[PDB]
Amino acid sequence: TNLCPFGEVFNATRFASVYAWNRKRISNCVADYSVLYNSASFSTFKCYGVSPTKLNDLCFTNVYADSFVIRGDEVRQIAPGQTGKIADYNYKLPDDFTGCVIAWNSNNLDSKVGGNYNYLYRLFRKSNLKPFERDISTEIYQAGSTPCNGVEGFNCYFPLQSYGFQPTYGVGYQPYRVVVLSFELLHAPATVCGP
Amino acid sequence: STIEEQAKTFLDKFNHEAEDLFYQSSLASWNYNTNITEENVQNMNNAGDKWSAFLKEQSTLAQMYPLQEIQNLTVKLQLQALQQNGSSVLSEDKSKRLNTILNTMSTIYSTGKVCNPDNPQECLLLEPGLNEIMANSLDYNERLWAWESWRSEVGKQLRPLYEEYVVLKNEMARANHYEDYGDYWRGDYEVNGVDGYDYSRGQLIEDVEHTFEEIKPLYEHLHAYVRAKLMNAYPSYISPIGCLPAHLLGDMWGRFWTNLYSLTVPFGQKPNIDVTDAMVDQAWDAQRIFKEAEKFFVSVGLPNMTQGFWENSMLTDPGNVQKAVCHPTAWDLGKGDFRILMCTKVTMDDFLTAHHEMGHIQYDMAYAAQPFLLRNGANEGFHEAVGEIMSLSAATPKHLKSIGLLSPDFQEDNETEINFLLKQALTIVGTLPFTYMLEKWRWMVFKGEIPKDQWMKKWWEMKREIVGVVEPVPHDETYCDPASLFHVSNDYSFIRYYTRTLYQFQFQEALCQAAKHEGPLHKCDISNSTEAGQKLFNMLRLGKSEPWTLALENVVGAKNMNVRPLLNYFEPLFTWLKDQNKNSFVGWSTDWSPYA
Ligand SMILES: *[C@@H]1O[C@H](CO)[C@@H](O[C@@H]2O[C@H](CO)[C@@H](O)[C@H](O)[C@H]2NC(C)=O)[C@H](O)[C@H]1NC(C)=O
Ligand SMILES: *[C@@H]1O[C@H](CO)[C@@H](O)[C@H](O)[C@H]1NC(C)=O
Ligand SMILES: *[C@@H]1O[C@H](CO)[C@@H](O)[C@H](O)[C@H]1NC(C)=O
Ligand SMILES: *[C@@H]1O[C@H](CO)[C@@H](O)[C@H](O)[C@H]1NC(C)=O
Ligand SMILES: *[C@@H]1O[C@H](CO)[C@@H](O)[C@H](O)[C@H]1NC(C)=O
Ligand SMILES: [Zn+2]
């Protein structure tokens, strides 16, 4: 009767920036997925492949919990086959994604009068991300043909940009904390079931 | 990577950078306009200075991408708009000279005072001092004193500054490859590279003059009826065939004839519709006023006001100690933040202004998904036209009865309709010759068709000829009377008030047709009609992303400014005016003046 440490992920003091998204591996524990789905504290709870309705009646080899912060209008990009700044440059889900996406508004925590610049996102990248890839590089993006020499200037821009969350922003620009549960199945012990 | 691909990336950095600096500048500006303190002045000036400096930098960086090599038109629009910024085209010295002239002229206008004879301590400013005289006084001599004193002690200060202001502005406009500064202003209506929707700067002059010709018959009869009524009240001061004296027009310049209503009301035994008493009887507050305005836009299919709007706006006067700038304004701070600043009182006028200001908000919300540089009305006249048609529908007796402010036992008779349309014509129609003539004079001055030693001679030749208004005192070339108006001395284009007036009645006529309105156009209420709201929204969400010719077509089915809906609005008055002036002279002689 070892309970999974979901509280460390959902109830964390600070979330990661989406470009530097976090991943906690979950193993050898009992997980109560019914508590999450029937908590009503979340504005988004969509599952793909698996169903939210009492699917604690299954077993998986490992569960990965990815957490980050984005703005409200970008939550729709945390989904299979979506494009945009987040889905192409920060955090990409695969087409065959089997798991759930959980999000809730966090204006009460991640917004400050005058701007909270702790949370960043990737604005430029030479190519799109493969699914579940992470890029934390701070190399200056070269948009022209002249080398940048590690500083920003003409056609040379530092790639990471900030949200600057303010409490008086619109819901579409307010911070949302996101948890992405990945469910993995290998020819393996399957050490996470939960009744 | 091509030049265009570099430009798309450059605008991506700009949008996200500007979006952030604009929000900080608007927040600081909002905090002062709601809590007026010294430290809030400092915060605004800082955030505003960083916003301006960021624009100067990005405007320079934008020029390094040459427009000839861009093909995506929506990209070229953003690149072009950022590039045209006149600080980095003139020399540093000449730009410094111009900004000093502009600031001095603005200061003279806002601090200029006039002191009555025999008492050099009892002085008056333009606002509220001289404006009260020109708006309420019936005494001929008092009005003449205020009119002349303003132009002889503040206008004469502005004359040397305006001459140098014209010289420097033309140099900046010519260096930006325009003919003159007036040509630069007409560039707001320019459209290129879109087949079937293009529009040249010169075509604006022809379309304004072509449409003004059709306005003349209605203006001539309104001018004639007003002259006859004024002559009854001032028999020794007004010629039955001459122009109207300039100081007897309801305000300092005769821009609007609104305050002539008391002396020109056709049926003075029939009172105006004024629901202010009913609002107080039902204990309405400001929140109820804006809740009803929100209800109005919902009824046509437009979205709710955002939760931030109710929490962040200021819809009442803050109090005694806390001071605010009470001019009603609609704020689009960006990042989804929409607010209205308004010191609302429980009155019919503030009830209608709320619909006007919330109409601005709906436009701001509708194009919020556009790129930052395209978040604006299709041209300079679109935004104000949208706001005006909201107060048109909300003020009708049809609308006021449905919302329980006008009793069901009030029936409009053709006399209160004529009273209403004349009051409308005094403001809406009376301003059109004033607006056209003023901007025409400025266009010719920038073009060079009027030499300096004939500025004032030509200014009053056109006032007599076009507006039918005559100066009460001869003015030599030490005067600068156009500069005695805010827009001329504070460097704002003026033709927008002419084009907007024609746009708004084109909008209202189209939306009432979609609403299946039966009757005269001025009684229409577009409430409860989603077809009208959908037709309006199709243009609102465009912003500046499409040519204004196409955006206008989305609402009215025509590609150009049209004066017919305006005349359709005032047809009941026009036939009444023509019957009124059957034994009156229609037109005016330009050689008569009150100084014989
Ligand atoms: C995050 O913290 C909240 C608050 O402590 C947890 O919700 C509580 O759950 C307990 C039962 O374990 C209840 O007794 C409390 O009433 C709940 N409070 C609230 C405010 O919900 C929540 O379970 C935590 N998150 C996770 C993933 O465990
Ligand atoms: C303006 O007023 C608010 C309360 O309405 C107050 O908290 C704030 O400090 C004031 N602003 C300044 C700059 O003094
Ligand atoms: C212009 O560029 C935007 C984004 O780069 C693209 O979505 C749009 O389709 C382009 N328009 C044309 C006409 O190519
Ligand atoms: C506005 O009303 C609609 C229903 O017409 C509702 O769905 C929406 O949530 C409301 N929005 C706000 C901000 O109240
Ligand atoms: C709009 O429809 C509502 C719903 O029936 C009605 O109460 C109201 O009087 C209508 N107003 C107008 C102006 O048609
Ligand atoms: Zn307005």
- What DSSP line would sit under A130-142, residue for residue? PTT------PPEE
Look up residue B434 and give its two tokens: 């004033």
CA distance B264 to B230: 7
Query: For residue B476, how many other CB atoms are within 10 A of its CB?
Result: 9
Tell me whether residues A170 and B12 touch, CB distance under 8 A.
no
The verdict on residue A90 lying in a domain is: yes
Alpha helices for B122-252 (secondary structure H): 131-136, 140-153, 155-175, 181-185, 201-233
The answer to whether the CB of A91 falls within 8 A of the CB of A18 is: yes
Per DSSP, the three-state class of A193 is coil
The verdict on residue A135 lying in a domain is: no
Strands (E), B381-523: 469-470
CA distance A182 to A192: 12
Strands A160-162 and A120-122: antiparallel
Give one DSSP letter per residue of B361-414, joined into a string.
HHHHHHTTTS-GGG-S-SSTTHHHHHHHHHHHHHTSHHHHHHTTSS-TT----H
Q: A interface mutation test: which of B4, B8, B9 has the most A CBs within 10 A?
A: B9
| H/E run at residue A24 | strand A22-26
CA distance B125 to B116: 11
> Does residue A6's CB lie within 6 angstroms of at least one atom of ligand 1?
yes
CA distance B457 to B454: 5
| Experimental approach | X-ray
Strands A22-26 and A141-142: unpaired
Look up residue B174 and give its two tokens: 């010519």
Q: Select from B6, B336, B337 the Cβ nearest to the Cβ of A144.
A: B6
The answer to whether the CB of A173 falls within 8 A of the CB of A73 is: yes
The answer to whether the CB of B26 falls within 8 A of the CB of A171 is: no
Q: What angle do CA B68, B74, B80 make, to 5 degrees?
A: 50
| H/E run at residue B43 | helix B38-63
Is the omega angle on the peptide bond into residue B235 within 30 degrees of 0, that is, cis?
no
Q: What angle do CA B167, B172, B174 make, to 5 degrees?
A: 90
CA distance A163 to A69: 10
Task: Considering only CA atoms, give the Rg of chain A.
Answer: 18
Strands B244-245 and B469-470: parallel
CA distance A136 to B573: 71
Closest CA to A54 of A36, A39, A33: A33
CA distance A150 to A140: 6
C-alpha dist (Å) from residue B524 to B417, B534, B569: 13, 17, 10
Considering Cα of B20, then B11, then B85, then B443, what sign does the dihedral take?
Answer: negative
Our count of domains for chain A comes to 1
CA distance B257 to B272: 18
Enumerate chain B positions whose Cβ falls within 8 A of a Cβ in A.
Answer: 1, 5-6, 9-10, 12-13, 16, 20, 23-24, 27, 61, 64, 306-308, 312, 333, 335-338
CA distance B490 to B484: 10
The verdict on residue A175 lying in a domain is: yes
CATH code, A48: 3.30.70.1840
Mark residue B319 as left, alpha or beta (left: phi above 0; alpha: psi -120 to 50; beta: remaining). Answer: left
Look up residue B481 and give its two tokens: 């009377």
CA distance B280 to B554: 41
CA distance B496 to B477: 28
Give one DSSP letter per residue of A56-119, joined into a string.
TT--BSEEEEEEEEEEGGGGGGSSTT--SHHHHHT----TT--EEEEEEE-HHHH--TT-B-S-
The verdict on residue A171 lying in a domain is: yes
The verdict on residue A130 lying in a domain is: no
Task: Considering only CA atoms, give the Rg of chain B.
Answer: 25
Q: What angle do CA B378, B382, B388 make, to 5 degrees?
A: 160
Q: Give first-to-last CA distance, chain A, whole Å.
A: 9
* Residues facing B14 on adjacent strands: none
The verdict on residue A195 lying in a domain is: no
Phi, psi angles (nearest 5°) of residue A24: -110, 125
In the chain, the amino acid numbered B202 is G
Instruction: Among B13, B14, B72, B374, say which to mutate for ligand 3: greatest number of ligand atoms within 8 Å of CB.
Output: B72
The answer to whether the CB of B306 falls within 8 A of the CB of B332 is: no
Whose Cα sits closest to atom 14 in ligand 2? Answer: B37
Contacts of B333 in chain A (CB under 8 A): 168
**Cross-sheet strand order for the sheet of A99-105:** A22-26, A62-71, A175-184, A99-105, A44-48
Look up residue B66 and give its two tokens: 């040459």
Q: Is residue B459 annotated as involved in ligand binding?
A: yes
* Known active-site residue B357: yes
The verdict on residue A75 lying in a domain is: yes
User: Residue A29 is part of which domain span?
Assistant: 7-121+162-184
Q: Select from A114, A154, A173 the Cβ nearest to the Cβ of B336.
A: A173
The verdict on residue A46 lying in a domain is: yes
